[PDB]
Amino acid sequence: IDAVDASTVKRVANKYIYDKDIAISAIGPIQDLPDYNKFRRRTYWNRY
């Protein structure tokens, strides 16, 4: 655990989170939930 520093978190996050595909499971009054492309786009920041 102590080995996981800030640089470690960023490295692991870039491997598993950045510009990666996602799975979505929603139930109920979910018309206002953004679609797959909106969630997909929000996996990267274009200002960096």
Partner 1 sequence: PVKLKAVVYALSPFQQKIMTGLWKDLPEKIHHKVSENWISATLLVTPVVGTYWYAQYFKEQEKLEHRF
> Judged by CB under 8 A, does residue 36 bind partner 1?
yes
Under 8 Å between Cβ of 19 and 44: yes
> Judged by CB under 8 A, does residue 25 bind partner 1?
no
In whole angstroms, give the CA distance from residue 15 to residue 46: 17
Q: Which stretch binds partner 1 (CB under 8 A): 1-9, 10-18, 31-39?
A: 31-39
> Judged by CB under 8 A, does residue 2 bind partner 1?
no
Q: At 38, is the secondary structure helix, strand, or coil?
A: helix
Positions that interact with partner 1 (CB under 8 A): 21, 31, 36-37, 40
